[PDB]
Amino acid sequence: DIERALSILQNVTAEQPYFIEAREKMADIYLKHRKDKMLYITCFREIAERMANPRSFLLLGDAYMNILEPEEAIVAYEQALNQNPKDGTLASKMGKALIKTHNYSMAITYYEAALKTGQKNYLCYDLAELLLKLKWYDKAEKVLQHALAHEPVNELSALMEDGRCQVLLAKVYSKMEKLGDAITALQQARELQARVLKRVQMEQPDAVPAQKHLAAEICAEIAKHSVAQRDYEKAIKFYREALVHCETDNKIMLELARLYLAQDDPDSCLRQCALLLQSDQDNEAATMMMADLMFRKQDYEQAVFHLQQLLERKPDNYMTLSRLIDLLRRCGKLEDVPRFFSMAEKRNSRAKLEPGFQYCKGLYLWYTGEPNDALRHFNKARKDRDWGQNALYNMIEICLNPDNETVGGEVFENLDGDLGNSTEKQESVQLAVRTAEKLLKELKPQTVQGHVQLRIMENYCLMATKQKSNVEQALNTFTEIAASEKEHIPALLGMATAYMILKQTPRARNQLKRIAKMNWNAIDAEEFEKSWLLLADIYIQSAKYDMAEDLLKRCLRHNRSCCKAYEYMGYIMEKEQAYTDAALNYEMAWKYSNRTNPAVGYKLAFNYLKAKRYVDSIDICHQVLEAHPTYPKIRKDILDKARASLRP
Amino acid sequence: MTYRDLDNDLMKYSAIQTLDGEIDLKLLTKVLAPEHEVREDDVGWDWDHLFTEVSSE
Amino acid sequence: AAKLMFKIADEEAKKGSKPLRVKKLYVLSALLIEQYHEQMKRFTDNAWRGAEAYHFFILAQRQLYEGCVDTALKTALHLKDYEDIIPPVEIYSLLALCACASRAFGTCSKAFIKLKSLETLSSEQKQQYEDLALEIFTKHTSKDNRKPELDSLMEGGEGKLPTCVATGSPITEYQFWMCSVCKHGVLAQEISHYSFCPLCHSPVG
């Protein structure tokens, strides 16, 4: 009976009580049932005309916001706020509408007037987060310092308010790089928060979990600032304090797990992972951190299986997928991957369009042996803030080194000359090098470590030019970085590679031995694996093959997929006249080239010929001619001598 | 393929993703159906066929 | 038959299916509602509503790909009426996009306020839309540098002009062509471009 409702509400007029609610109901009915915004607005203008007061003007503002007319909403909030200047809720609703209408100076000055009149706790946050989102972090800093310029008030509310103002000033000081002041502000918040707790326990005990959690979060931020100051022991201490406040907060558990990891306690890290997984089984970071610890403990089957279980809970998960892909690369079990792409596609038909899928797919093709398809799939990801940033680094790897060679390795850079002496290979490769600098210009850094890794890879582009001034500049940046950080593996590999290109091979040799003594880690892993291969080449130049074999096998122990680790080892087995074990290495290199390495194709057929396996040799001579028609030498020497033996 | 040859995957769509070289809209662009499925023709429909076609997809 | 065809058109809309497939599904239903009305000789009373919704949603995207972003904006403004059929996310995303490309950043602000209000969104999604809105607002403004005026009809008090199915804009003509099947109007100039009705694909007459 909509007309019974409207006629009753219309029978409430300017001289009667509750006319505001009656006209709001008329407005609401006309918007719901007649779809009429003008009947809604005229009912609301009747409220403004007949019953002008601060609450009716506030409600009129909110009505105009539901109607998407914020200018009349601001007129309504003005008609309220000039009458009740004490209401911080109205001043904040005023602030919201002024922000939605670019009236930022009015919002700022209303919040300043509310703060100067001593209004409620959150107004420091409203003004600070506004100024922060406007990137005026310095204005927020000065505002929060001015909001703390009083002698600290001993009231339980004011202690907690000043504690939150101090926490918020520390959150701003983080963006100011003022991390010591952030610690002092957080310790001053911890001092205030102790005074809060020692009254709350006696006069407000129902607030204890929230106030303990705020004390935990203060201790967590003190710990974060101490990580940025490289005092990881203070970081463990103040995250242990954050646990002593709250033993079961997901981020505090995960962060002390990260620090038990970072300070080489994998057992206490596994305790925090197990507790976190018991508190929530679907915590992806705890599963992946636990899987990495299983991988470090060589429980690779568990590391895989826990990421597989997490993908069977969450099929569309590009972090867990890309972690599982590298576990399967390091195990040498790449054939298991396509299942997990199909699971994402089955859950989400659009998954193929997503930059994290495109990043995971781009990684796979680089490991199967298709650098062009890897580049195509990385390129589709490349602008994304996570997946595109990580794709760009792998595009730069391919654009620097598309054949994945030891740059300056004498066992193979003295070969390939029928292509390597051509302008076609030279100019196309050097264009890829000179445009890897543009991929590096797309890697905008957000940390000093990001700037250093960026500068190193720009200097890897400068090395890869082989122009002497560029290679000397690269050596100089690498030696400058190594002088600032004597263990910085990507710079030490830079020094060695530049020295090899400069023919200063004795200076390269010691700077690689320097790396070879260090323990491996998952971040420097590729530069470790490259450095061991470049040092193994230099050891083959020295003919001391035993140290090369050790480096090649150490490389395979950290990553069983490495085709170059096998291809160098197969060459040593052929030098040692072990044509069978050479054929085993060449069979892996044939397989993991996706049969695109016809030089290994020749070697594999030739080693089968010498092993008195003439049918197997002829099988491979067909596979080489299939892989490449008109490929030189093989037909006459291998294929026709294997045929000629076949019945003697 | 060069870097420029790959960048063709992004070059055309950038004009819908981006405004004045200052703003990026990609979060909103997730709603868009692709141009070749959004295009329409001056071609007629009949109920038997239109039902058969919609049933065949 | 119309009710079951509408049930499919509703589910396939809510899946986020191909927009033109969903236009075809509501057109199949509307033609069955017309066949039930023919058999006489509030789902009963509004036959073409879902066909209009997906038609104007496709037309706004066509006008965006055509670079005609102010026409895309007018068509996307007309979609405000169809929140019962097309989820508000798609409407106000496409409206915010066309408003931003048009430099109607106040109309874009309207669409962003409408988006953030949605109770189906996470705080993360609300924040992501706010981040984009504030990026636009800080880099240009949160106000219209160029103004659409179609809200002059969409407030409903003065009534509404019929939106042309060929263009997604209100018909200002005093008298004009109307489709003998779906009974929507088209501008007497624009109908000359077509052999079949842009909404229902019936032959023009």
Side-chain angles (χ1 to χ4, degrees), chain A residues 123-133 140 143-144 168 172:
Chain A
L123 296 170
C124 292
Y125 190 84
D126 269 17
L127 184 52
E129 190 69 32
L130 173 59
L131 293 169
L132 185 163
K133 286 170 174 176
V143 160
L144 292 161
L168 177 56
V172 175

Side-chain angles (χ1 to χ4, degrees), chain A residues 158-364:
Chain A
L159 290 168
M160 186 275 289
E161 287 159 28
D162 295 347
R164 293 193 74 254
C165 295
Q166 285 273 22
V167 166
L168 177 56
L169 178 54
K171 296 280 182 175
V172 175
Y173 282 148
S174 188
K175 284 177 168 66
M176 311 312 296
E177 310 295 342
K178 293 178 182 176
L179 312 191
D181 295 328
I183 290 179
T184 63
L186 290 159
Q187 290 288 14
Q188 289 159 18
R190 185 53 169 65
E191 289 157 27
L192 291 162
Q193 192 64 9
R195 303 323 306 162
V196 173
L197 289 168
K198 294 292 181 180
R199 300 294 74 177
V200 165
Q201 287 283 12
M202 313 312 167
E203 301 182 347
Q204 311 179 2
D206 296 335
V208 168
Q211 298 299 351
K212 282 186 173 183
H213 187 274
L214 183 58
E217 196 275 347
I218 286 160
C219 297
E221 288 291 329
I222 292 162
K224 291 181 191 173
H225 292 299
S226 73
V227 177
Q229 295 167 339
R230 287 62 173 182
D231 194 340
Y232 314 136
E233 282 58 58
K234 279 188 188 91
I236 282 190
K237 176 56 169 170
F238 290 110
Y239 272 113
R240 280 182 165 197
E241 297 319 313
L243 285 180
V244 169
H245 290 300
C246 288
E247 291 292 340
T248 62
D249 173 278
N250 301 286
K251 278 65 170 182
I252 286 162
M253 295 163 98
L254 186 68
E255 282 279 292
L256 194 65
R258 284 171 175 161
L259 291 167
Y260 289 151
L261 204 157
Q263 291 141 273
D264 308 323
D265 187 353
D267 297 332
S268 300
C269 188
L270 282 166
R271 292 189 299 107
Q272 290 300 327
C273 295
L275 294 163
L276 181 50
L277 291 165
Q278 288 157 18
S279 74
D280 184 1
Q281 300 179 2
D282 304 331
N283 189 291
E284 294 157 42
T287 314
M288 291 183 296
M289 190 185 299
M290 175 269 291
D292 291 345
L293 294 156
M294 292 295 170
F295 160 96
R296 275 294 201 168
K297 291 190 174 194
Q298 310 210 66
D299 293 335
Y300 305 118
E301 299 187 319
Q302 297 297 340
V304 165
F305 178 46
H306 298 311
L307 300 207
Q308 290 182 331
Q309 285 163 90
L310 179 57
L311 289 160
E312 288 172 359
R313 293 186 181 217
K314 294 180 170 178
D316 189 337
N317 195 278
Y318 307 125
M319 194 61 77
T320 305
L321 180 57
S322 57
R323 294 327 84 189
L324 176 61
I325 286 173
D326 192 44
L327 290 173
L328 293 170
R329 181 181 67 140
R330 292 178 184 287
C331 297
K333 299 188 181 183
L334 296 180
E335 302 89 343
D336 296 356
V337 176
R339 182 179 185 261
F340 303 90
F341 291 124
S342 84
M343 293 160 60
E345 293 166 24
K346 280 180 176 182
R347 185 182 185 276
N348 171 16
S349 60
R350 304 182 75 192
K352 297 184 180 181
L353 310 179
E354 304 184 6
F357 185 101
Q358 289 292 335
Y359 166 72
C360 293
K361 195 70 171 181
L363 291 174
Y364 190 64

Side-chain angles (χ1 to χ4, degrees), chain A residues 31 45 51 469 503 523 627:
Chain A
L31 185 63
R45 286 180 177 179
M51 295 202 171
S469 59
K503 306 100 178 182
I523 304 93

Side-chain angles (χ1 to χ4, degrees), chain A residues 565-576:
Chain A
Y566 300 116
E567 189 178 43
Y568 272 95
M569 184 153 60
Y571 193 81
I572 297 168
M573 296 298 92
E574 188 172 314
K575 288 287 186 179
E576 293 209 327

Side-chain angles (χ1 to χ4, degrees), chain C residues 4 16 18-19 25 34 41 45 85-86 99-100 115 127 134 156 166 186 190 197:
Chain C
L4 286 185
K18 303 190 183 193
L25 283 161
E34 293 292 351
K41 302 177 181 171
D45 303 1
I85 298 188
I86 299 183
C100 190
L115 286 165
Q127 184 177 3
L134 294 181
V186 181
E190 303 299 299
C197 175

Side-chain angles (χ1 to χ4, degrees), chain A residues 319-462:
Chain A
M319 194 61 77
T320 305
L321 180 57
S322 57
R323 294 327 84 189
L324 176 61
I325 286 173
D326 192 44
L327 290 173
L328 293 170
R329 181 181 67 140
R330 292 178 184 287
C331 297
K333 299 188 181 183
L334 296 180
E335 302 89 343
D336 296 356
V337 176
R339 182 179 185 261
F340 303 90
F341 291 124
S342 84
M343 293 160 60
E345 293 166 24
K346 280 180 176 182
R347 185 182 185 276
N348 171 16
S349 60
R350 304 182 75 192
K352 297 184 180 181
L353 310 179
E354 304 184 6
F357 185 101
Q358 289 292 335
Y359 166 72
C360 293
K361 195 70 171 181
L363 291 174
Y364 190 64
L365 290 153
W366 172 232
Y367 309 145
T368 60
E370 286 63 46
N372 303 319
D373 300 333
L375 279 174
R376 288 162 179 151
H377 285 293
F378 292 140
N379 178 71
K380 288 175 179 179
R382 89 177 204 268
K383 291 192 177 189
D384 179 288
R385 186 167 171 74
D386 295 339
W387 309 121
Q389 196 89 335
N390 298 340
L392 280 170
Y393 284 110
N394 289 274
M395 299 186 72
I396 290 150
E397 292 274 41
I398 297 172
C399 294
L400 285 168
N401 189 4
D403 297 344
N404 192 25
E405 296 296 3
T406 41
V407 178
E410 294 290 304
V411 183
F412 296 106
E413 289 210 1
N414 289 299
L415 305 179
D416 196 38
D418 294 352
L419 303 183
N421 299 341
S422 78
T423 54
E424 299 193 327
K425 193 162 179 172
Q426 289 169 9
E427 292 177 7
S428 60
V429 172
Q430 292 300 345
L431 179 61
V433 170
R434 290 169 182 149
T435 55
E437 304 181 33
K438 298 192 173 186
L439 294 167
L440 286 155
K441 288 177 180 182
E442 291 187 322
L443 286 173
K444 264 67 180 183
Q446 297 193 127
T447 67
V448 178
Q449 300 91 338
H451 289 80
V452 170
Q453 185 67 353
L454 168 61
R455 287 166 182 173
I456 288 170
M457 292 295 152
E458 289 181 331
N459 284 274
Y460 281 38
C461 303
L462 290 164

Side-chain angles (χ1 to χ4, degrees), chain B residues 15-16 18-20 23 25 28, chain C residues 63-64 67-77 93-109 136 140-141 143-149:
Chain B
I16 302 98
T18 68
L19 172 65
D20 216 348
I23 289 162
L25 308 180
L28 303 176
Chain C
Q63 287 167 337
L64 176 63
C68 298
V69 305
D70 299 349
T71 72
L73 170 59
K74 288 178 182 182
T75 306
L77 285 164
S93 299
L94 181 62
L95 176 58
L97 194 172
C98 297
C100 190
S102 184
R103 311 186 187 242
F105 312 112
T107 301
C108 198
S109 186
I136 292 157
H140 298 307
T141 178
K143 302 199 75 176
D144 288 340
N145 290 358
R146 302 192 307 127
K147 298 176 182 178
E149 296 188 324

Side-chain angles (χ1 to χ4, degrees), chain B residues 16 19-20 22-29 31-48 50-51 53-57, chain C residues 18-21 23-25 27-28 31-32 55 58 61-62 64-65 90 93-94 97 100 103 105 128-129 132 136 139-140 193-196 200-201:
Chain B
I16 302 98
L19 172 65
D20 216 348
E22 293 188 315
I23 289 162
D24 180 350
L25 308 180
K26 190 170 185 173
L27 177 63
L28 303 176
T29 77
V31 160
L32 302 177
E35 186 188 327
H36 63 281
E37 300 193 316
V38 162
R39 286 188 305 235
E40 291 180 293
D41 304 316
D42 185 26
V43 176
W45 298 343
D46 185 14
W47 203 102
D48 295 336
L50 184 64
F51 169 80
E53 182 176 299
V54 170
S55 303
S56 72
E57 292 182 321
Chain C
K18 303 190 183 193
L20 181 56
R21 177 182 166 75
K23 183 193 178 189
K24 290 176 177 177
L25 283 161
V27 166
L28 285 164
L31 289 167
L32 288 166
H55 182 65
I58 296 152
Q61 294 171 86
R62 285 198 291 110
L64 176 63
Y65 290 126
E90 287 90 300
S93 299
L94 181 62
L97 194 172
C100 190
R103 311 186 187 242
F105 312 112
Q128 287 158 349
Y129 291 125
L132 178 60
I136 292 157
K139 292 182 176 178
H140 298 307
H193 306 168
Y194 294 93
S195 318
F196 305 93
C200 67
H201 294 259

